[PDB]
Design a protein around this nucleic acid. Sequence first.
RNA 1: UUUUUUU
RNA 2: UUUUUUU
Lengths: 172, 172
Amino acid sequence: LGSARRLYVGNIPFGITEEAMMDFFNAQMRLGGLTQAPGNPVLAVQINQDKNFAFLEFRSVDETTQAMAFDGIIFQGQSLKIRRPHDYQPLPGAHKLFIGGLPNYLNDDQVKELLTSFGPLKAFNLVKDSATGLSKGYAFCEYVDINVTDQAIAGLNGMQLGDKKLLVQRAS
Amino acid sequence: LGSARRLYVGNIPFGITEEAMMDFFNAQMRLGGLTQAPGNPVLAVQINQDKNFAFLEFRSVDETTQAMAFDGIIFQGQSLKIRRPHDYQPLPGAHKLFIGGLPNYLNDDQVKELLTSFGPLKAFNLVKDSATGLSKGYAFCEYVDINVTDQAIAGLNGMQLGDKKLLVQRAS
RNA sequence: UUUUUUU
RNA sequence: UUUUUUU
């Protein structure tokens, strides 16, 4: 959703205004060259004064990520604790893998079986030609435990299938 | 409210303009290095000429406080009397205390009882884990008579509770 | 109660 | 479970 665009920042200075918070972060983002396009990343920032925390709202997912390098930064005597929201979890194509070099003959279930070995998948799609309808020789997938991704890359990449050499790498 | 952002300045020079007042204070704030962020602290200043006083409006709570060191400053032959507004009183988390090292077993009423001893509280919260729901081992509170704060720190800090050493200090 | 306390 | 995780 939009949780990949918000950040929790705790241990905020007492009585700091929401605007002062915004100005500080947009400025840090600019001074570091961390923005992806022209204009300010931080759109808004809501403060829960008693609970001593604020949430930063960003315009983009990547900039939300980039700002995390500011964890611990000193601002008005307080060292800021920047964290992702609790409802947060990586977006659907976050660790999606590209698997090419597949023999044209294998079908979904067959291809999936070769991947499933390293663990259960959360998403998968084998590209088939519009008219023809058979495999185009490559597919995309993604495991549930996003940590098994690298283990799967190592094990599957380069593997010999038919007269083809498999190619596995993150699709992004 | 916004009373932690205004200041009463009495004994102002006769016929002084509101703008001259503003320029004088923003300049003092800059010459002393008393500002927290770029830009002028003093946003506005209203003068009640007959009553011989003006109020300064600041952009931040801390800068409002910082300017008070200018009490008695000579300006156009008159020694300025800087004071907080009368409606003023410290903001909700002003003297909030952090209390850590609490045994996970104690509950709100139990924890509160250990604090209440030094006087009545105006605010209190014991942090409990989102799912689990039990104490995370630390709480925040604040007494009504904000003077008992130090007396409570001395008495409670370091106290032995279970197999833990209590830690009490202002939460800011 | 020896310089005036307001949105 | 030693600084408080929300649209």
